[PDB]
Structure of Hemolymph juvenile hormone binding protein:
Amino acid sequence: GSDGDALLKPCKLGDMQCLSSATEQFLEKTSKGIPQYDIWPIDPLVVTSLDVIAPSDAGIVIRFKNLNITGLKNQQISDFQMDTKAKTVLLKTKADLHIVGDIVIELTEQSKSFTGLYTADTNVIGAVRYGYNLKNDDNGVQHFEVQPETFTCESIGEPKITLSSDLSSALEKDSGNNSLEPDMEPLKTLRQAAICKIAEACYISVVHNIRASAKILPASSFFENLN
Ligand SMILES: COC(=O)/C=C(\C)CC/C=C(\C)CC[C@H]1OC1(C)C
């Protein structure tokens, strides 16, 4: 990652150009993850495993493994709302996410299981709501209180699903589509629950990074003035 000449800087409130630029840059640096700042990587982002249930029949269970998600550290903030009167910050991010890893299709109703490769590429637009407060740490420095954020999926643009020739063929042949339909289920979840779930997993990493960082730097570090 050829990005180490910057990580975080003071921005003005209401400036979607400064704030957004900060989240993009900071995320870009932490994208590699560094144990020196208690920051985990998120680009590329590998998932040792990712289970997801399908409401289609409450029996289809898709368990992904070693999922490679790239194209997030360079995301773009779609919207953001900062309220001091309520100390709340709701901002949504959108960017082309590329997932590449394993996928296990365990049918509880059909009493079967499958394993293959899963490759998806599409834009993921999700909204996150988290509170923000200002309190002096145990040293006397006004730190930044990062409340528990909340994931809120919005859209996924054009979900481009791409399963291995063995898996994709095993599904289309198991359902009778012969072309594995996108909205035929469990495929429906492979583009909805899959994308959404993945986004959440990554959101936890990015959030944690900022949390630990706020412990090393004050609030002013993020905004030129928050009081
Ligand atoms: C999802 O993106 C962010 O949280 C980052 C933004 C809006 C730009 C940089 C500013 C912060 C991380 C400060 C937000 C506030 O939650 C604290 C306490 C970190």
